[PDB]
Design a protein around this nucleic acid. Sequence first.
DNA 1: CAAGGCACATGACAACGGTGTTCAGTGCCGCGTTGCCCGATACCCCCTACCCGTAGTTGACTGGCATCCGGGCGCCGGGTCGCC
Length: 88
Amino acid sequence: EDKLANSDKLAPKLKRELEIIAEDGRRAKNHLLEANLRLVVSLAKRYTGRGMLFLDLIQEGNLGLIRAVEKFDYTKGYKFSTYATWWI
DNA sequence: CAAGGCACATGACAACGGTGTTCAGTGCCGCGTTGCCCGATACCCCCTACCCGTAGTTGACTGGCATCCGGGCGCCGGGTCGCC
């Protein structure tokens, strides 16, 4: 998608291939998000009972997880579950 | 005895007496209005102290919560699956 964003002309087939791999990356993103939805529910339960509805805390944890995924990469030699909980 | 001569007073004649009025000019005391002079007060500036919003923090850590019955009472009204 970075290459697609550039104004320089790319012939259409390679641009479509770039879009396809970008869509596959988005699907991987969604897979990771659904994988850790369980993580945030436990973390939100870790903070329930303080004037905020449990499902509202779960949604806010979902937002934090979205941030963590958008800022997570394998360059760190650690699992995702360790890096996520801080941002959650 | 009648006519002509001299005294005192007399028809007017202005000008003083004394006092009252005229324009006018200017003040003389009463009532009210005005420039100062300051003094405080709103209103620009500079400085830093502290409130408040945003963004990171990497061992691992991946599904909870306690409900709820002793109304009571009846009806409406619809759903809901058997029934033959």
